[PDB]
Task: structure prediction
Amino acid sequence: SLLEFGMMILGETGKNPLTSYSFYGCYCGVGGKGTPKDATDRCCFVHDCCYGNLPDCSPKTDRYKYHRENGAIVCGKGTSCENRICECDRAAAICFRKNLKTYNYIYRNYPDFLCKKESEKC
Amino acid sequence: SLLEFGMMILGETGKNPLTSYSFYGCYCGVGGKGTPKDATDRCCFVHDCCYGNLPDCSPKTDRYKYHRENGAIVCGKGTSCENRICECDRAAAICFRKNLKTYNYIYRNYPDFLCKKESEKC
Result:
């Protein structure tokens, strides 16, 4: 669920997701459209695609468990849905971490009006 | 949404919600029933009741903004639904903080089978 996802982002990046990953670029936030502005934004695009590929699940609300082994996120053994949702979230958190090096505050609060370009397909 | 709720619990209590408030007593977790075991558990019961009183909203998934003024949680100015959801979450986070003093690890992983008592009404 989004509860676990927020904690996972914080644990993996060191950044509060509400201030760094909630209104960024064209995809990190509500109503994603157009093309990703940078690598960080593309993490959000790919996460949206991952959730969209799970119509038989409830990715935002279905709780799951995770932990760490050797510093790394390990998803718990849950239902098929919980496992798939957790893997979407894990992939995204690791993507944010790997792309911290090109994070740019200039894309915070980027206006949706400038994302009115043909939306990239998953 | 649950994303904000998790961050709010962490910020207010200092505790990871996934390890302290996700499998506790009869109500802090999935499928709450019976009677709250202690004050902390009753925070979860009341939060469930608060969300249940918002059938015209989507409390688990509707994102909102919050911040702090003088150390205290202040909900952002959103839709009526966002405002109401945020106030449910704020109340719960502050309830957890106020009842840290009676938190008991013995109620972690409390079995649902022992909560098969007539469920308290909201």
Notes: Chain B has one domain: 1-122.
